[PDB]
Each structure stands twice: as C-alpha cells, then as structure tokens.
Amino acid sequence: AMMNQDIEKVLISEEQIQEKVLELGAIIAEDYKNTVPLAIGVLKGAMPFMADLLKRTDTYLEMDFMAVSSTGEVKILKDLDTSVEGRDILIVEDIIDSGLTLSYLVDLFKYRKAKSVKIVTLLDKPTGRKVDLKADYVGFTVPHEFVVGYGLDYKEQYRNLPYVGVLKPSVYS
Amino acid sequence: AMMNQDIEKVLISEEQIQEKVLELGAIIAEDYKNTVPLAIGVLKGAMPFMADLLKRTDTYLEMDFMAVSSTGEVKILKDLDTSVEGRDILIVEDIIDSGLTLSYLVDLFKYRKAKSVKIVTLLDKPTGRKVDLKADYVGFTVPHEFVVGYGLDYKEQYRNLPYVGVLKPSVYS
Ligand SMILES: O=P(O)(O)OC[C@H]1O[C@H](OP(=O)(O)OP(=O)(O)O)[C@H](O)[C@@H]1O
Ligand SMILES: O=P(O)(O)OC[C@H]1O[C@H](OP(=O)(O)OP(=O)(O)O)[C@H](O)[C@@H]1O
Ligand SMILES: Nc1nc2cc[nH]c2c(=O)[nH]1
Ligand SMILES: Nc1nc2cc[nH]c2c(=O)[nH]1
Ligand SMILES: [Mg+2]
Ligand SMILES: [Mg+2]
Ligand SMILES: [Mg+2]
Ligand SMILES: [Mg+2]
C-alpha cells in the first residue's frame, strides 16, 4: 500500500476515467464507422488509456505504436511497422503539455501521406504550450502541475497507478 | 455494433478477465514487493492485458516494450530502451501458443544478465507447444483454436474487443 502514500491529491479518479473512456469510445466509434483507422499509441505513457479507450470503441480498427524521446529536438526510438499512406490515423496520447511531441508526429504522418490525422489524449495541460497544438478529443484538462499515474511517470515509476494524481513534496526529496 | 456479429462464441468474458486481473495483480504485487521490476510488454498483443493487470498491481515498478516477429527464426523489430542488467524482469504477454516467442525473449534477457525473469500471460494454449515453455502466472487456459480479442488480432483487427472470442467461419472466407 505504498504508492498511494506518495500522492498528495487524486486529481482524476479511476471512476471518472472509466466514465470518460466509455463516452469517448462511443463517439470515436461513430467517427470512424466507415473506415478501418490505424490507432497509434505513443509509448510509453499512452498504453493504459489506449487499452481502456479502444476496449470501449466498438469499430474495426488496427493498432501500432511509436516511441519518441523529448531543446525541441524530437527523436524516434521506435517507428511504425505499418504504412500510413492513405490511412486514417488516430494518435493516442496520455498528455499534451508543450505540444512538441505531437507537433512532430502529426507532420511526420502528413509527410507520409496519411489520409487524415486526428489525436485523442487522456489529459491536456493547455498552460504548458510552447507550440500551437490541439487534440480532436480530450479526456480531461489539468492544471499547471506535474501529474503522475494512468501511464504518466516520475522517473519511470507510478505509470501503473489506476488514477491521476500529484506527488507529495518529499517524493521530490 | 458490428465486430460482435463476427464472433461465434465468447470464450472468456470481460467480467471474467476483470476478476482475474484483480486476483493476479495482488499476487504479483506481493511477489515484487521488495524490488522495482521492469515489466516488459510484448507488442502488439500484450497491451490491453498489461494495462489492466498493472493498474491492479499495487507496487513500484517500471515498464518497457518490445516488438518481435516470428521457420522458428524470431526477429526483434523494437528492442528495449532500458538495460536489464541486474533487474528483475516480468514479461507480459497475451498468449503463449508454440512457445517460440517467449523462449527467444527469456534467453535474450538471461544473456543480458537479468537478475530474474518471470512471465505473466493472459492466455495459455498448451496444446500448441513446440518447445518447452511455461509462464509463472497464467490468466486462463484456452483450447486448440484460433482466438481473438483483448489484444489478439486476426489480420491486425479485433484487438480492441473487450473479451476473448472465436471468429465465425465466414470471416476466414
Ligand atoms: O507535449 P509535450 O511537452 O511534448 O509532453 C508530452 C509528452 O511527454 C511524455 O512523454 P515522455 O517523453 O515523458 O515519454 P514517456 O511517455 O515514455 O514517459 C508524455 O507521455 C507525452 O508523450
Ligand atoms: O507462442 P507463439 O507461437 O510464439 O505465439 C505467441 C505470440 O504470437 C502473437 O503475437 P504475433 O506475432 O501475432 O504479433 P502481435 O502480438 O503483434 O499480434 C501473440 O501475441 C504472441 O506474442
Ligand atoms: N508524468 C508526467 N510527464 C509529463 C510530460 C510532460 N508533462 C508531464 C506531466 O505533467 N506528468
Ligand atoms: N489472434 C491470435 N494470435 C495467435 C498467435 C498464436 N496463437 C494465436 C491465437 O490463438 N490467436
Ligand atoms: Mg509520452
Ligand atoms: Mg514520461
Ligand atoms: Mg504478440
Ligand atoms: Mg498477432
């Protein structure tokens, strides 16, 4: 019962997330009802949201995954194993903060001739923006705080919390 | 409401999976209570189980991901971004069938000097084995047929079903 003792405040509960993914999943299913999109998870943080969102998205779709790191220079650690040419792409993310990561990826998929590119993110932190980037679908907006949980790490830990929270001061030493 | 029409039988319901991940998560949390393991998801299929299992695993842990493609020759498409040297590794998988994929990965992590290597899989199909390989933790045993859902694809589709099922014969046509 240790991680919970590191959390100062639960910002978004597991029950809130469960309701929101049920809602978004049905809306996204209708949006994509006449195509087989490629849903692309941005590793590592997107995995819990992507799993639970797409379980609630009752439509035919395919999945793939990318890994990126990050001065404004973004590096691909793992590229797709699927062509995006002529595909409808849905990028799945855990948080948009500065906007850098998704600005890079959207331009990459447009360069590769995607038919359309949309974004769904669990969390959006609009106060963090350094470039203009908005998602098509957003679970929750969050304040200008470092959050963890439901995919989001502090030094690679806490991703497995089933809720989104803020850390206690002492955790930062 | 269309994928369901492709399914002849639900083998394992969403409620069954939810109960089993709750049980396994608590067991695994105790096993790993005195270490920070590296949980490694085998893409693409492991993502739904890994998300839902680790949300129910109340312990400190880190995550990473690998992608492989199976003659018996296994190909790494995406390697880890984390060293396994001296780490306790938990491999997370959706199904073990022939055993090839995981026999490859276990040997790779031992070669890289992991302190320990264990496996948790959602499904196990013991009738499919071509090499000797057993997981430390198994959600469900399944019979000798092709299943889809909860991560498992037919031609990259059906991974987003929230249950495990068998496809109607017409789908193969
Ligand atoms: O909008 P940005 O300012 O670009 O920040 C958002 C990105 O940063 C985090 O990923 P991180 O690089 O920490 O990798 P991780 O997902 O593996 O934790 C987060 O999951 C997003 O991908
Ligand atoms: O025990 P085996 O006979 O080795 O079969 C098990 C593997 O095969 C499937 O993966 P697949 O190669 O289809 O890739 P996927 O996970 O991306 O679907 C499955 O998800 C396991 O990883
Ligand atoms: N865990 C975590 N990662 C990032 C990356 C950008 N913003 C955040 C945040 O608020 N929390
Ligand atoms: N979808 C799916 N993939 C694999 C890969 C090995 N066995 C199976 C199975 O039964 N179903
Ligand atoms: Mg990320
Ligand atoms: Mg991070
Ligand atoms: Mg697989
Ligand atoms: Mg497969």
Residue numbers in the entry:
A (entry chain B), B (entry chain A): 0 to 69, 77 to 179
Paper excerpt:
HPRT is a purine salvage enzyme that converts purine bases and PRPP to GMP and IMP, which are precursors of the essential nucleotide GTP. HPRT activity was previously found to be inhibited by (p)ppGpp in several bacteria including Bacillus subtilis. To examine the molecular determinants underlying (p)ppGpp regulation of HPRT, we turned to Hpt-1 from the pathogenic bacterium B. anthracis, which pppGpp competitively inhibits similarly to B. subtilis HPRT.
The HPRT-substrates structure diffracted to 1.64 Å containing two molecules in the asymmetric unit, and PRPP and 9-deazaguanine were coordinated by two Mg2+ ions with each monomer. The purine ring of ppGpp overlaps with the purine base substrate, and the two phosphate arms of ppGpp and PRPP both spread across the active site between loop I and loop III. We noticed a significant difference between the ppGpp- and substrates-bound tertiary structures in the conformation of a flexible loop. This loop, also called loop II, is common to all HPRTs and covers the active site during catalysis. In the substrates-bound state, loop II is instead shifted ≈4 Å toward the active site from its position in the dimer-dimer interface. Loop II also pulls its flanking dimer interface components β3 and α3 toward the active site. While crystal contacts likely prevent loop II from completely moving over the active site, PISA analysis predicts that these changes abolish the dimer-dimer interaction. Taken together, these data reveal that HPRT binds PRPP as catalytically active dimers, whereas (p)ppGpp maintains HPRT as tetramers.
